[PDB]
């Protein structure tokens, strides 16, 4: 069989020969105790380039050696794509929300031979599940695997945007020192108000990394949180979002995409948030009006807006979010840590182990499985 698996180009520097450190941590488990990947052989070493072209997330070795074959390919967009051109033959594909393949009802129409679609990541937004749905394909996602390297992202950008590290690392780097031009925007975190739009995996582990900085929490979710977490780590819970944004300094957006927060964040919602506020947003470019955040930090009804997400992806040279003032963006990079890279790609072959020895896939990857929802 075929398998399809679009990953984002080496860098421009060519693939790394050498990285500044030996190793990486052993993660075995995850909060609450789910386990870390189980695939029954890796071939590389965690902390390995995993998710560009030439590291194909480790798989061709096991995949050759069971007579399949492997199209690994950066080439996602058109029909004149890679991508596209060995879509119709392939029984599996495989992308990374970073640099993704989206499967359209057209593309998985002409996606004859597919059957397993595979997010190399969490989020499966860039597939359309209702024609999966019709179709029988089943859809995986590697849970867990980088939910604590996003919350890790969150609370560093929180405290970039309100401490004004950027612009006071750009006095150093000119020959300035500028004491007052740096902090005539910045302030301590400590004991303000900090809400989260989820508290699911990356989002209770935001809010257990925020405790201890001795801020004021918030939380929207449609279910809450036991009361024993609520009371250990002084939650307060908000039946709804605008409640919620009313009374925070800060706003952290851990939610996935769906029609619910499709949008969410647009120029009314942003409104309803304290002048001065900070929003924080590496859950789906989408869930924010693109146009409604400039105008916002344009107007100063927002102070400063970071996240690592974007739409569409590749951001175009031209998008908006890259000049708007007061922001601190980078790529979407926080799930692809090397870190995150070899949890996601040891689930990747996790999956693949269990689809050709006709084991079933674990439950919590599965987002659809023999035409439903899981
Ligand atoms: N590199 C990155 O930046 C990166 C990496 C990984 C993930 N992500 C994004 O972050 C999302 C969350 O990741 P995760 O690991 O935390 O997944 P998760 O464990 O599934 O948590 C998602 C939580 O969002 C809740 N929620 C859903 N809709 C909501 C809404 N309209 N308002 C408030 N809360 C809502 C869900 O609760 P219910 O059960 O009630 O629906 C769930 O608890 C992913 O879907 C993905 O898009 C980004
Ligand atoms: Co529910
Ligand atoms: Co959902």
């Known amino acids: ?34 386990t870390a990947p189980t695939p029954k052989q890796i071939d590389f070493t965690p902390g390995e380039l995993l998710g560009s072209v030439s590291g194909e997330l480790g798989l061709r070795k096991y995949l050759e050696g069971l007579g399949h074959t492997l199209v690994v390919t950066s080439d996602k967009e058109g029909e004149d794509s890679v991508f596209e051109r060995e879509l119709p033959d392939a029984e599996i594909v495989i992308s990374q929300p970073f640099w993704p393949a989206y499967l359209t009802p057209e593309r998985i129409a002409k996606a004859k031979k597919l059957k397993l679609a595979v997010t190399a990541g969490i989020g499966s937004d860039h597939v359309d599940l209702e024609a999966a749905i019709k179709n029988g394909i089943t859809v995986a996602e590697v849970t867990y695997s980088n939910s604590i390297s996003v919350s890790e992202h969150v609370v560093m950008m929180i405290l970039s945007l309100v401490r004004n590290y950027i612009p006071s690392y750009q006095w150093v780097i000119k020959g300035g020192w500028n004491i007052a031009d740096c902090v005539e925007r910045s302030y301590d975190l400590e004991a303000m108000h900090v809400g989260t739009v989820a508290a699911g995996r990356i989002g209770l582990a935001v809010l257990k990394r925020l405790k201890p900085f001795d801020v004021k929490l918030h939380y929207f979710s449609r279910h809450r949180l036991p009361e024993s977490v609520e009371n250990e780590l002084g939650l307060t819970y908000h039946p709804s979002v605008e409640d919620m944004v009313k ?19 647009n120029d009314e919602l942003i409104s309803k948030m304290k002048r001065g506020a900070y929003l924080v947003n590496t ?3 989408k869930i924010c009006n693109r146009d409604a955040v400039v105008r916002a930090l344009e107007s100063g009804q927002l102070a400063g807006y970071a996240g690592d997400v974007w739409f569409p992806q590749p951001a175009p040279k031209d998008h908006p979010w890259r000049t708007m003032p007061h922001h601190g963006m980078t790529p979407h990079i926080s799930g692809t840590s090397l870190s995150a890279q070899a949890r996601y790609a040891a689930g990747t072959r996790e999956i693949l182990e269990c689809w050709f020895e006709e084991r079933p896939i674990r439950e919590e990857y599965l987002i659809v499985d023999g035409g439903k929802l899981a």
């Open 1 to 34: 069989a075929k398998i399809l698996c679009v990953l984002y180009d080496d860098p421009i520097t060519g693939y790394p020969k050498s990285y500044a450190r030996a190793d990486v941590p052993k993660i075995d488990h995850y909060p609450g105790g789910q």
């Open 247 to 265: 009374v925070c300094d800060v706003v952290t957006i851990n939610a996935p995409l769906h029609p619910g927060t499709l949008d969410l964040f």
């Open 283 to 285: 859950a789906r470019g």
